[PDB]
Amino acid sequence: DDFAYLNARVRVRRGTLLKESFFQEALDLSFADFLRLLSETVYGGELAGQGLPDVDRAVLRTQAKLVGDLPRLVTGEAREAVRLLLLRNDLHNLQALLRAKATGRPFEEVLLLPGTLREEVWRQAYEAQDPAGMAQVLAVPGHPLARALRAVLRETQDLARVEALLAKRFFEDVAKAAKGLDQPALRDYLALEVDAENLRTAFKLQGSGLAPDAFFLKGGRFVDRVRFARLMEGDYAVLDELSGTPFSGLSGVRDLKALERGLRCVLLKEAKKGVQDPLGVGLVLAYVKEREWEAVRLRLLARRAYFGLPRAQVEEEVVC
Amino acid sequence: GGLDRGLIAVGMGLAVGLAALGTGVAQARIGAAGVGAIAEDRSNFGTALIFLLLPETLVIFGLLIAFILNGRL
Amino acid sequence: GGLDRGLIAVGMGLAVGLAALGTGVAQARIGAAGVGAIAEDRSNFGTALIFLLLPETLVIFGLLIAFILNGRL
Amino acid sequence: GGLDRGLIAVGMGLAVGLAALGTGVAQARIGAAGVGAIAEDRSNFGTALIFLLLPETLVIFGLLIAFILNGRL
Amino acid sequence: GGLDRGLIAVGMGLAVGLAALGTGVAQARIGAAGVGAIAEDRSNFGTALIFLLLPETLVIFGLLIAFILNGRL
Amino acid sequence: GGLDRGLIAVGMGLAVGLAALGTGVAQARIGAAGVGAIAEDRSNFGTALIFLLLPETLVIFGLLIAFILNGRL
Amino acid sequence: GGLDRGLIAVGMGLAVGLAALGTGVAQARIGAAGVGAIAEDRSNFGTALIFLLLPETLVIFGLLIAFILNGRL
Amino acid sequence: GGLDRGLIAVGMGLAVGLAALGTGVAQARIGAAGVGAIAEDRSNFGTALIFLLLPETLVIFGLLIAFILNGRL
Amino acid sequence: GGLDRGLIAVGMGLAVGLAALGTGVAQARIGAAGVGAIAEDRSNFGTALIFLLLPETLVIFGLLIAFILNGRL
Amino acid sequence: GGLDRGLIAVGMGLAVGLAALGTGVAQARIGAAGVGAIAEDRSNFGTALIFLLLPETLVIFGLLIAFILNGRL
Amino acid sequence: GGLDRGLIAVGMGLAVGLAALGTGVAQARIGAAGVGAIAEDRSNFGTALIFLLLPETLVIFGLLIAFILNGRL
Amino acid sequence: GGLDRGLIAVGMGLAVGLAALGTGVAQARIGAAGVGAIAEDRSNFGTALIFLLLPETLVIFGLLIAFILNGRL
Amino acid sequence: GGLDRGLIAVGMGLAVGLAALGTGVAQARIGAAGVGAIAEDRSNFGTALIFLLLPETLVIFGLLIAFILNGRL
Amino acid sequence: MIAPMEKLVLAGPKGRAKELLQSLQQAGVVHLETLRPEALSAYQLSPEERAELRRWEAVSAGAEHTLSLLGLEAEPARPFPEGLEAAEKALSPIQAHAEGLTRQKQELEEELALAQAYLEPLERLAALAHGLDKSPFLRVIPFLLTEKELPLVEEALRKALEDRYLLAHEAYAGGVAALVVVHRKEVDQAKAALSRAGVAELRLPGALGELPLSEAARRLKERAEAAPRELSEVRQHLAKLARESASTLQSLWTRAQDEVARLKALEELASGRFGFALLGYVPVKAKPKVEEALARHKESVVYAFEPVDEHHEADRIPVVLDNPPWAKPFELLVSFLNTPKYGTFDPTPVVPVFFPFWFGMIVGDIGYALLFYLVGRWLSGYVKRNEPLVIDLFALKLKPQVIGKLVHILNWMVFWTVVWGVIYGEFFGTFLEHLGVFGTPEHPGLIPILIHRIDTAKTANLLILLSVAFGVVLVFFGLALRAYLGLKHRHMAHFWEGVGYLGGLVGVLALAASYLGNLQAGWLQGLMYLGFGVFLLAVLMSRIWLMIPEIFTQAGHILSHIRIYAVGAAGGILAGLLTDVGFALAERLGLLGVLLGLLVAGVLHLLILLLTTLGHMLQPIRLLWVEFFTKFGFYEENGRPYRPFKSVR
C-alpha cells in the first residue's frame, strides 16, 4: 500500500499510547491498584484481574493485537519492508518450533508467540517436523527470512547445526533485505541494531571462544569483525574505542546488565529519532518500538507491584 | 472555419487530455487506500466510497470546458 | 478538405487517449490492492469488484466527448 | 482570423487541463492520507475535509483565467 | 491527403498511443502485485485471471477507434 | 488582437497552469504531512494549516504575470 | 510530394512509441515480481512465462496500427 | 508587432511557468519535511522559515524576467 | 517533397527511440531483480537470464517498423 | 526585430525555465535531507545551508544566458 | 532548397536522445543493484558488469539506426 | 533573418536548459545523501562533496553547445 | 540552411538535452548508492566512483552527434 | 617509485632479543612480519611481560586521560625516561589533582544550573508560604505556576481550607508556587488532583529539596553566593595545574607509547628455544639503517639485509611510493585513492606533469592567476609558520605539512596557469574595455593573443582537436602500460587483451576519420582494416565473450578529453562576458561610478570563479583517474602498506 496513507493511521495509533508520566506516577499503585491503573492505560481494555500472571497475559494480548495487527492498509509492496521490523518474535517462534520438533516436546507445549507467521501454520509445521516441511509451512513470500530458513532447512537436518545456521543466516538475510531497501531510516536503524546485537553477543560470549568470523555478526556499523573479535577477547579498551557511533556509550566495561541497559536505551533513542520522516516507514518503526518499550515497562512494573518490588530499580525498565 | 476550425478542436482536446490526469492521479491513491482499509473499515466503507467519488469535480469541469468550446465552435 | 477535419480528429483522439490513461492510472492501484485482498481471502470479493469496476467512468466520458467531436467534424 | 480564435482556445483549454492535473496530484496524496487517518479514527472524518478541499484554489484561479480568455472570444 | 487526411491519421495514432499507455499503466501495478500472492496461492489462477482480464478494455476500444478513424480516412 | 492577443493569452495560460501545477505539487506532500500530524495530535492543526497554505504564493505571482499580460493584451 | 504519407508515418511512429512505453511500464514491475517468485521457487516459472506473455500485446497492437496507417498512406 | 509580440508573450509565459513548476517541486519536499518536524517538535516553528522561503526564489526570478520582457515589449 | 522525406526520418527515429525507452524501462527492474538473484545464488541466475531476456521485444519491433518506413522512403 | 528578437527572447526564457526546473528538482531532495538533519540538530546547519544553497548555480547560469540573449535580441 | 536535411537531423537527434533516456532508465536500477551486490561480496564483479553492460543493446541499436539515416542523408 | 536567428537561439536554449535539468536531477539525490552522511559524521564532508560535484559537468555540454550556436548566430 | 539549418540546430539541441536527461536519471541513483557505500567503507571509493562515472558514454556519444551536426552545418 | 625493499631475517638469544627489539624500535626503519609457524612457537609472552604490559598500558591510558582532563592534546614530544613505577608515581599526583578538581568543577556547574532553576522559584514559594507548612494540622501543595492553567486544575482540586486560602495562581509567575493548602496534613488528596490536572509541586533537589521552606531557601541563597566563587576557584586551579603538568604529561605519554609499542612488538615476535628470532622488511635504501643497528647487538646472528621476495606468490610485500622531489608534493592525488599490489606502475609522478598543463590551459586567466597568487600569499603565513592549519568550519584538520605540500603543488600549477593566461589573452577575464593589451584582431592594444574573444571561429575546432588528441595520447599510454605490466607479470591474456584494445581503438578511429571524417582514406584504409582485424584477433585469443563494448567505452573516454576544451572555452567566454559587462556598466555607463561597477563585476566574477575553479580542478583530475588510471589499474587491487616500527619521537 502507501507508506504515507499507512503513516497517517500509524500516527494515530502511536499517539494512542501511554506516556512517560503515566508509568512514572503509576509506580506507587501496587497489585490491584497497579492492575487498575493499567486497566486505565491504552491496554486498559485487556486488563481483567490483578497479579503478575494476568498482567503479563494481558500485556501479551495487547501487544499481539496492537502491534501484531500491522497490515491494515499497509500491506502489499510496503509489506516486504514493514515485516522486516517484525523479525525477532517470529524468529523465536520458529527456533522453538524446530527445537521442540527435534526434541519431542509437545506441539501444545510450544507457546507459539504470535508474529510474522500464523500460529495455525506453526501448529501444522509441528506435524511437518522435517526441515523442508517446516520451511514449506513457513514459506512467506513477504518475509524472505523464510528463504534463509529453507537454506538452513536444506543446510542439514540435525537440530544443533540447523538452529546455529538458521539464527545467523536469518540475521544476515534480514540485514541484507534492509540494505536493499529504499528507506534510509530503516537501513540505518537495522544496521545499527545488527551492530549492537553483535556487541551484545560478544559481551555475553566473552570467553566463549567461538571463531570470531561466525560469532561476531556481520554488517557491523559499530564494530568490525576484528573489533568484535577483540571485544570477545580481553580488550575492554575496545569498548572505549567503540565511541563515536550512536553506540558511543561503551567505556572499558565488560558488564552485561549495564550493556543491555545501554543498548536498549540507545536503540530506543534511535528508533524514536525518525519522527521527522512521517511518510517513510520511520513512523511505523517509532510506533513499533514505542509499543514494545511500553509493553516491557508495563509488564516489569506489574511484576514489581504484584511481588512488592520497585520497577525502576533499573532505569532500563522505566519507559525504554 | 479555417485555422480556427481545427485549432479550437485541438485546444479543447488538449484541455480534456490534461484534465483527465487529475483523476488519474487522485483516484489511484484514493482507491488503493480504500481497498486496503475496506475490510477493516466497514465503519467507513460508505465513507471510503464517498472519498473515492470525491475527485470527480475536475473531470466535470473538464467536460464543461469541452462543452463550452464545442458551443464556441 | 483542409485544416479542419484532421485537426478535429486529433483533438478528439488525444483527449480520448488521455482519458484512458487517467482511467488506467486509477485502476492500476485500485485493482492491485483489491486483487491482493481477494487472493489473500474471498471475504470482501464483492466490495473489491465494485471498487475495481467503479473507476471505469472516465474512459466512457472521454469516449463520449470524442464521439461528440467526431460528430461536430 | 482563424489564428486568433484557435490560439485563444488552445491557450485557455490546455491551461485549464494542466491546472486540473495539478489539483488531482494533491488530491491523490492528501486524499489517501485522509482516508488512512479517518479509517484509523472515524472522528476527524469530517475535520480532514477542511484541508482536503483546499487544493481547489489553483483550479478555481485557472478556471477564472480561462473564463476571461473565453470571454475575450 | 493534404492536411485533413494526414492530420486525422496522426490523431488516430496519438489516440492509439495514449490508450496503450493507459492500458500498460493499469496493467503494471496490478499484474506486478498479484504475482507474489499467486506464488503464495499457486492454485488461485481463477482470481488471477479475474484481474488479468481487466486491462483489455482500453485495448479493445483503442483498436475500434483506430478502425473507425481508418474508415473515415 | 489576432497574432498578438491570442498568443499572449496562450503564454499567460501556460504560465498560470504551470504555476498551479507547482502549487499542487507542493500541496500534495504538505497536506499529507499536515493530515498525519493533525490526526496524531490536533494540537498544532492551526499551525499546520498556516504552513500548508504557503504553496500558493507562486500561483499568485503567476496570476499577477497573467494579469499584466491581459492588461497589455 | 505529399503532405499525407509523412504525416501518416509520423503518427504511426508516435503510436508505436507510446505503445512500447506503456508495454515497458507494465513489463518492468510485472516481470520483476514474476522473476522474484520464480527464483523463490523454480516451479513458479510456469506461471511466470504466462505473465511475461502479457506485455507483448501492446507492442503487437502498436505495430499493427502502424502497418495499417503506413499502407493506407 | 503581431507575431513578434505573441512569441515574446508565449516565451515569457513558458519561462515563468517552468520556474514556478521547479519552485513548487522543491517546496513539496521542503514543506513535507517542515510539517514532519513541526509535528515532531516546536523547534520547527523557528528556522523552518529559510527552508520554506528558499522555494520562492525561482518564482521571483521568473517573474522578474517576465516583467523585464514585458517592459521591453 | 524533399521535406516529406525528412518527415519519415523524424517519424522513424522517434519510433525507434521511444521503443528503446520502453525496452529500457522494462529492463531496469528486471535487471535489478536479476542482479539480486545472482548475488543470492547462481541457481537463481540461470532462470533469471530467461526472465531478463524479455525487454528487447519492444526495441526489435520499433527497429523493424523504422526499417520498413525508411525502406519505403 | 520581429522574428529574431522575439524568438531569441522565447528561447532564453525557455532555457531559464528549464534550468529553474532542474534547480528546484535538486533543491527538493537537498532541502528535505537538510530539514531532517536540522531537526536532528541545528549544529550541522553550517554545512547544511551550504549544501542547500549551492545548487542555485544552474539558475544563476540560466539567468545569465537569458540576459546575454536579451542583449543579443 | 527547403528543409529536409533539418528534418532528418531532428529525427536522428530525437532518436539518439530517446535511446539515451532508455539506457539511463535501465542503468539506474541495474547499477544500484550491482553496487549493492559488489559491496556485499567482491566475488561477483564479473556478473555485475555482465548485467550492467546488457542495456547497451538499445544504445547500439539507436546508433545503428542513426548511422543508417546519416548514410541515407 | 529571424527565420534562422530564432531557430538558432531557441535551439541552443533547449539543449542548455535540458542539460541543466539533468544536472539538477542527479544533484538532488547526490547532495541529499551527502548532507545526510555529513550530518552523520563530519568526516564525510569532503569525501562526499567530491563525488557530489560530478553532476556539475553535465550543464557544461549544454553551455558549450549554446556558446557555439551564439557564435554561429 | 535557413529553415533547414534551424531545424538541424533544434534537432541537435533536443538530442543533447534528452541524452543529458537519461544520463542524469541513471547517475542520481547509482551515485547515491555509491555515496552510501563509500561512507560505509572508505575502501569502497575505488569501485564507487568508477561505477558512478562509468555511464557517461551516452552523454559522450550525444555530444559527438551534436558535433557531427555542427560540422555538417 | 615503489621500491621492493628487502628482508631482514635475524635470530638471537631469548634474553638478548628483548634488547634487540628495543634497538630496532629506536632505529625505526623496518616493518615487521609474523614468522609464527617457523617450526616454533611465536615467542609466547612471559607472565612478567604481560604484567609490565598491563602496567604500561594503564600508564599510557592515564596519560591520555590526564591530557584530556587538563585540556591538552596527546602531542608526542621528547619522552620522560623513568621506571614504570616512577612514571606511575609521576602520573598519580596529576591524575588525582585532575580527577578531584574535575569532579568539583562539574559539581559546582550542576549546582549553579540547579540554582538558576530553583533560587528565584524557591524564594517565591517561601514568600507564598505565609505560615509553616510543617504544622501537622495542615499541609500544602506548592504547584509551579509558570503556566496559568492552575484554575483549570482547581476544578478537580476545589477543596479549600476551612481557615483561609486554596489552590490558585501565585505571585512571581516565573517562579510561582501554588498555595494549595489543606488541613489535617491531608493535602495528599489535593496533590492527587493537582497531579491529575495542572502542574506538580515545585520540588527541589538536595538541601533545597530535603529541607523545609526556610532552611531550603537559606541553603539556596548560600549556594547562590558560593557557586560563582567555587567555579572560579576550580577553574583557576585546574588551569594552573594543567599549565604546570602539561610538559611532564606529554613526555610521559611519549615514553609510554614507545615502551608499549616495543612490548607489543615483542609480543608479535617468534621464539627460539632459549633463543629468539626476528623478521620483517625494510627498504633497500634502509639496508644501511639495518646494518648500522646491527652493531649494538654485535652478535648479529643473521643481521644482514637479505633480498626481498620474488614476485611469485608474495602478496605480503609492503609498498611505499617515495616519488622524486619534483613529483613529491603531488603524491596527495594518489594518496586519496587506493593502493597497488606490489608491481603495478605508479602513476603519481606523472600527475605533477600532466595535470598542471591542462589545468592551467582551462585556467588560462591572468586575473585568476593573480587571485590565486594572492590567496597563496595569504595562506603562506600559516604554511611557513607551522601555525594551526586546521579549520573547524568544514571539519578541516589541516596540518602545516599538508600546507607545505599543497603550496608547492599550487605554485607549480599556477606557473603553467599564468602562462596559459598570457597565451589565451585573458586578463581579469577581459580587460579589453580598459585596454585590449592581449591584442585582439579587431583592435590590438599590445602583443596579440592567438585565441581571443570570438576567435572560436576556428579556435573552437582547434581546441577540440587538441583536447581529443591529448586524450588519445594519454589513453594509448595507459593501455600500453596495462599491456606491458600484464606481460611483465606473465599475464599473457591480460597483455593480449590490452594490445587488442589499443589496436581496435586505432582501427575504429581510423575508420571514423576516414569514412565519416575528411578525405584521404587510402593510406588509412589499411590502418583501419588492421585495427579491426587486431580487435578480432584479440577476441579470438581471449576466446568467447570478451566484450568489445569495453574497448568502445574506452574510445568514448578518449573522446571525453574534449571536455577539457569545452570547459576552457566556456570559462573564457564567461569570464570575458562578465568583465566586459562590468566595464560597460562601470566606464561605458558614464565612467562616474567606474570603480564601483568594476568592483561589483570582480566580486561576482570571484563568486562564479569559486565553482569555476572547483570544476577546473576536479574535472581534469576526474578525467585522469577515471580514464588514464583506470585503464590499467591502481583503481583496483590492493597490497600491504609499510609501517616503520616505533620511531615516534
Q: Residue-wise over B35-69: b if at least 16 C-beta within 10 A, else e?
A: bbbbbbbeebbebbbebbebbbbbbebbbebbebb
Q: What b/e string do you get for N505-534 counting C-beta neighbours within 10 Å, with b at 16 or more? A: bbbbbbbeebeeeeeeeeebeebbeebbeb
Taking residue N189's Cβ as centre, other Cβ atoms within 10 Å add up to: 13
Q: Tell me the three state secondary structure of residue N144.
A: strand
Copy the grid coordinates of residue N6: 628487502
C-alpha cell at I64: 523493424
Task: Give ∠ CA I63-I68-I72 in degrees, rounded to 5.
Answer: 145
A277 and J36 in contact by Cβ < 8 A?
yes
L71 Cα distance to chain centroid: 21
Minimal-distance CA residue of chain E relative to C33: E30
Indicate the residue of K23, K51, K61 with minimum beta-carbon distance to I35: K51
G23 in Cβ contact with G59 (< 8 Å): yes
Distances (CA, A) of N48 to N53, N81, N478: 8, 20, 57
- How far is Cα N429 from Cα N576, in angstroms, rounded to an integer? 5
Q: Which of I17, M9, I64 is nearest to K63 (CA)?
A: I17
| DSSP code per residue over E5-52 | HHHHHHHHHHHHHHHHHHHHHHHHHHHHHHHHHHHHTTT-HHHHHHHH
The technique is: cryo-EM
The burial class, CB within 10 Å (0-12 / 13-18 / 19+), for N457 is exposed
| I54, G31 Cβ separation under 8 angstroms | yes
Task: Provide the 8-state DSSP code for G42.
Answer: G
Closest CA to G69 of I72, I1, K62, C64: I72
- Of the CA atoms within 13 Å of residue G51, those in its CB half-sphere come to 33
CA end-to-end span of chain A, whole Å? 30
d(CA A302, CA A305): 5
- Write out the residues of chain A at the interface with chain E, using a CB-CB cutoff of 8 A: 76-77, 139-142
The residues facing N439 across adjacent strands are N448
Chain D residues 31-50 within an 8 A CB cutoff of chain A: 32-37, 39-41
Look at residues C29, A143, C55 and name the one whose alpha carbon lies nearest to residue B36: C29
Closest CA to G1 of I71, I70, I6, K11: I6
DSSP state letter for N177: B
**Helix ranges restricted to H, L1-73:** 2-40, 44-52, 58-71
Kind plus residue range of the DSSP H or E element containing N271: strand N270-271
K54 touches chain N (CB under 8 A): no
Dist CA N61 CA N301 (whole Å): 37
CA distance A5 to F31: 12
The answer to whether M57 touches N556, Cβ cutoff 8 Å, is: yes
Cell matching residue F37: 500530524
Q: Measure the CA–CA gap between N101 and N93, rounded to whole angstroms.
A: 12
Q: How open is the CA angle L60-L61-L66, to the nearest 5 degrees?
A: 95
Which 8-state DSSP code applies to residue D54? T
Residues D29 and F31 sit within 8 Å (Cβ to Cβ) = yes
Closest CA to A301 of A31, A68, A39: A31
Instruction: Indicate the SS3 state at residue A100.
Output: helix
Nearest-CA neighbor of N617 among L50, M60, L55, L60? L50
Residue I72 near residue G69 (C-beta atoms within 8 A) = no
**Do K9 and M7 form a contact (C-beta atoms < 8 A)?**
yes
What gap in Å lies between CA C55 and CA C51, rounded to an integer? Answer: 7
CA-to-CA distance for J48 and J36, rounded, in angstroms? 10
Alpha-carbon separation of residue A284 from A195, A277, B71, C73 (angstroms): 21, 10, 53, 56
Q: Give A57: exposed, middle or buried? Use CB within 10 Å, 0-12, 13-18, 19+.
A: middle
Chain M stretch 10-39, residues whose beta carbon is closer than 8 A to a beta carbon of chain K: 10-19, 21-30, 32-34, 37
Bridge partners, residue A212, by sequence: none
**Whole-angstrom distance, CA of residue N79 vs CA of residue N93:** 19
Instruction: Give dist(CA I61, CA A254) in Å, integer.
Output: 67
Query: Cα angle at G32 between G26 and G36, to 5 degrees?
Result: 150
The C-alpha atoms of residue C72 and residue B10 are separated, in whole angstroms, by 13
I33: nearest Cα among A181, G23, G34, K54: G34
Q: Which residues of C touch A75 (CB under 8 A)?
A: 36
d(CA D34, CA D28) in angstroms, rounded, equals: 10
H or E element in which residue K61 lies: helix K56-72
Question: β-strands N6-7, N31-32: how paired?
Answer: unpaired
Residues 6+ apart with CB under 8 A from A95: A163, A166, A167
- Residue of G61, G62, G51, G60 lying closest to G28 (CA atoms): G51
Q: Compute and round to an integer the Cα radius of gyration of chain C.
A: 17
Task: Measure the CA–CA gap between N293 and N30, rounded to whole angstroms.
Answer: 11
Q: How many CB pairs below 8 Å do chains B and C form together?
A: 143
C53: CB partners within 8 A, 6+ apart: none
Dihedral (CA of A295, A300, A306, A312) sign: negative
Q: Could you tell me which of N427, N321, N238 has the C-alpha nearest to residue N3? A: N321
N275: helix, coil or strand? Answer: strand
Q: Is G64 on the interface with I (CB under 8 A)?
A: no
| HSE-up of residue H54 (Cα within 13 Å, Cβ side) | 32
> CB distance from N631 to chain M under 8 Å?
no
Phi–psi pair at E55, nearest 5 degrees: -65, -20
Whole-number Å distance between alpha carbons of K45 and N255:
48
Look up residue B7 and give its three cell numbers.
485549432
> What angle in degrees, to the nearest 10, is found between the helix axes of K56-72 and I2-40?
160
Distance of CA H63 to the CA centre of its chain: 9
Q: How far apart are CA L70 and CA M2, in angstroms?
A: 15
Three-state DSSP at N641 gives strand
Whether residue C16 contacts residue C63, with contact meaning beta carbons closer than 8 Å, is answered with yes
Which H or E run includes M33? helix M3-40
| Distance (Å, whole) CA A303 – CA N423 | 86
Distance CA(F48)–CA(F36), nearest Å, equals 10
Q: Are the C-beta atoms of residues H5 and H72 closer than 8 Å to each other?
A: no
In angstroms, the CA C58 to CA C63 distance is 8
Cβ contact C7–E7 (<8 Å): yes
Residues of A with a Cβ under 8 Å from any C Cβ are 1, 75-76
Is there a contact between M20 and L19 if contact means CB atoms under 8 Å apart?
A: yes
DSSP state of N160: B
If one counts every other C-beta atom within 10 angstroms of the C-beta of residue J5, the result is 22
Q: Per DSSP, what are the bridge partners of residue N393?
A: none
Find residue N166's DSSP bridge partners: N160
3-state SS, residue N166: strand
Closest among E43, N636, D28 to F32, alpha carbons compared: D28
**Sign of the dihedral defined by the CA atoms of residues N454, N457, N458, N463, in that order:** positive
Residue at grid coordinates 616493518: N31
Q: What is the DSSP string of C2-69?
A: -SSHHHHHHHHHHHHHHHHHHHHHHHHHHHHHHHHHHHH-SSSHHHHHHHHHGGGHHHHHHHHHHHHH
Distance CA N176, CA H27 (A): 44
User: Do B and I share at least 3 CB pairs under 8 Å?
Assistant: no
Name chain F's partners: 3 or more CB pairs within 8 A: A, D, H
**Residue of D7, E10, D14 lying closest to C7 (CA atoms):** E10
Grid coordinates given for A92:
523465536
Residue A52 to residue A301: CA distance in whole angstroms: 9
Measured N-to-C along each axis, helices I2-40 and G5-40 cross at an angle, to the nearest 10 degrees, of 0
Are the C-beta atoms of A126 and A100 separated by less than 8 Å? yes
Size (chain L), residues: 73
Q: Is D34 in Cβ contact with B58 (below 8 Å)? A: no
Contact H44, F44 (CB under 8 A): no
Instruction: Report the C-alpha gap between L44 and A139 in whole angstroms.
Output: 41
Closest CA to J65 of H61, M23, H54: H61
d(CA N236, CA N19): 45
CA distance A260 to N361: 61
CA distances from N388 to B4, N242, N383, N433 (A): 75, 21, 9, 43
Q: Taking Cα atoms as reference points, which of A204, A217, A210 lies closest to residue A169?
A: A217
- Nearest residue of K to residue A179 by CA position? K36
Subunits adjacent to chain A (3 or more Cβ pairs under 8 Å):
B, C, D, E, F, G, H, J, K, N
Helix ranges (H only) for chain A are: 5-15, 20-25, 32-39, 52-66, 79-82, 88-103, 119-127, 131-137, 145-155, 159-179, 184-204, 212-215, 225-232, 237-241, 257-271, 282-306
